[PDB]
């Protein structure tokens, strides 16, 4: 039909969408993990909120630093997809699955993915580029 352009569903807005916009509006939810006598206890509460938020951003960024992508928010890695993790067609995943239920399915298996991608591929891409730079 006729159109005018995209819209703005806002912060956490595509939490019920079935991939699509939720797999496109990655930039609207990653931009506010930083948020851009009575004062001897309240200020300690406010600073403990802000510094913990800075920790919350930085320790999630360090895991993306380990998995060498550097083109953030979307990056590809060459680990093959085991069928034991999830037995679904990609048309079932990317048309008929919200992100929250997908994480609810995967979340028992996520630490194995994290350990395998940290241990195997970054130790098999580095110490091979030094071998490629022999001559």
């Amino acid at each position: 039909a006729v159109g005018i352009g995209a819209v703005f569903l806002g912060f956490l807005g595509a939490a019920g969408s079935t991939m699509g916009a939720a797999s496109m509006t990655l930039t609207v939810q990653a931009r506010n993990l930083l948020s851009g006598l009575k004062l001897t206890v309240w200020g300690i509460k406010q600073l403990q909120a802000r510094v913990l938020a800075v920790e919350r951003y930085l320790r999630d960024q360090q895991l993306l630093g380990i998995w060498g992508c550097s083109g953030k928010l979307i990056c590809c890695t060459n680990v093959p997809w085991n069928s034991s993790w999830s037995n679904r067609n990609l048309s079932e995943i990317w048309d008929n699955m919200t992100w929250l239920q997908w994480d609810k399915e995967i979340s028992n298996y996520t630490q194995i993915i994290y350990g395998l991608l940290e241990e195997s591929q970054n130790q098999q891409e580095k110490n091979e580029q030094d071998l490629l730079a022999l001559d």
Partner: nanobody
Amino acid sequence: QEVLVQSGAEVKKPGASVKVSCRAFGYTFTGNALHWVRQAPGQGLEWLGWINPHSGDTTTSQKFQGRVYMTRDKSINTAFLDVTRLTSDDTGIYYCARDKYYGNEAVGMDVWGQGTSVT
């Protein structure tokens, strides 16, 4: 829980301009485009145009270019319609409507306001 509330009924002189408001409750205002449709009493609907509330772009039919203007306000979640150079043809009930907006296009007008009578 999602409604559109409009302003009261107005009577105006020919050649003047009329402004009618439409406030959105119960849905995110910057997420769905808004249609404006009128109905003179005695027959069916007539269509003016529709507006993106986020980017600010408008679209107006060719019968009413330069006469019908559409604005919006994000701070109070409202849409304003200005009709200028009035005749006796435009007397009727005006409607703002929420587009369904699936797949970055127009799909259907789901939630409509109660209507504003302009004479």
